[PDB]
Amino acid sequence: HHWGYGKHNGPEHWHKDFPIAKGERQSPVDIDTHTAKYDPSLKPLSVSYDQATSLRILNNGHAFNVEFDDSQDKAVLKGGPLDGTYRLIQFHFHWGSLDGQGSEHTVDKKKYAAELHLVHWNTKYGDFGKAVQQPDGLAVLGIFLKVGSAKPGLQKVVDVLDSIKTKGKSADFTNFDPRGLLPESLDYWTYPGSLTTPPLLECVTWIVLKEPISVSSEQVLKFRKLNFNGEGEPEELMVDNWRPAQPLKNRQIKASFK
Numbered sequence: 001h002h003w004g005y006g007k008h009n010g011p012e013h014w015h016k017d018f019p020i021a022k023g024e025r026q027s028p029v030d031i032d033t034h035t036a037k038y039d040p041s042l043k044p045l046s047v048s049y050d051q052a053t054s055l056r057i058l059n060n061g062h063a064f065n066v067e068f069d070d071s072q073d074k075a076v077l078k079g080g081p082l083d084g085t086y087r088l089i090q091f092h093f094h095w096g097s098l099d100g101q102g103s104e105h106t107v108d109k110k111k112y113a114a115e116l117h118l119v120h121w122n123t124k125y126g127d128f129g130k131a132v133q134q135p136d137g138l139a140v141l142g143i144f145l146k147v148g149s150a151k152p153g154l155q156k157v158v159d160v161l162d163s164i165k166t167k168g169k170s171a172d173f174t175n176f177d178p179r180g181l182l183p184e185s186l187d188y189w190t191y192p193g194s195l196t197t198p199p200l201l202e203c204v205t206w207i208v209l210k211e212p213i214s215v216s217s218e219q220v221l222k223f224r225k226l227n228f229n230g231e232g233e234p235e236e237l238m239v240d241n242w243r244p245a246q247p248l249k250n251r252q253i254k255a256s257f258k
């Protein structure tokens, strides 16, 4: 009986195994746009992905992860609210059963169809496992997906999903360029938070871009054909793998833009 996104093991149950679920800096949150305050001291984000080395795509039973070589400073996030250098380790998405839900963050209570998370770790802690034990260990870049025009840079991801349908399947996924998943603007909101899955560690500086990317209905329909289950188990579609908004508590969301 492990955690997941069902009635019996979903987000409302996670606190029993992971009491930090009821902590002071949990993610995601609702971004109240009128309340977020413009912080003119925030720097432009620096997204340096031209030397990114993708390696593999994995169905881990909760999402699919596109994994990168993080054994050197190739693909790094710097600037914005961050001190120092954060290496890209993986990206994944959260998505819904329907276009009207799927995102983890919300904007004035609006849910997007999906949300992309590019996960980076602070190189001053040496490895990812040490970084998640630190309050400034990770930086996650969150990007909303809305359904409209196709995202050309997503199609190579969509087309490999047939090969990792079930939990524990992986496939080689080299030479994928994550710059193809970014919107035009790097305007963002930022706040201190957590991992949005168990173990729910409070180690994340969240950077959520204001501008969504557009994906096609066909692209997100292919996400929804993935399975939570392993091969040879009853089929459980991988949909609604999102944690809902958590209480903001004693936090301020800052905007990089007016």
Ligand SMILES: CCc1ccc(CCOc2ccc(C[C@H]3SC(=O)NC3=O)cc2)nc1
Residues within 6 Å of the ligand: 117, 119, 128, 129, 132, 140, 194, 195, 196, 197, 198, 199
């Ligand atoms: C390199 C080996 C390693 C591996 C995982 C962990 C602890 C768990 O860490 C994590 C577990 C889940 C996630 C994904 C979370 S956080 C987010 O933004 N969205 C998710 O789904 C991110 C980190 N420690 C060490």
Ligand SMILES: [Zn+2]
Residues within 6 Å of the ligand: 092, 093, 094, 117, 196
């Ligand atoms: Zn995530």
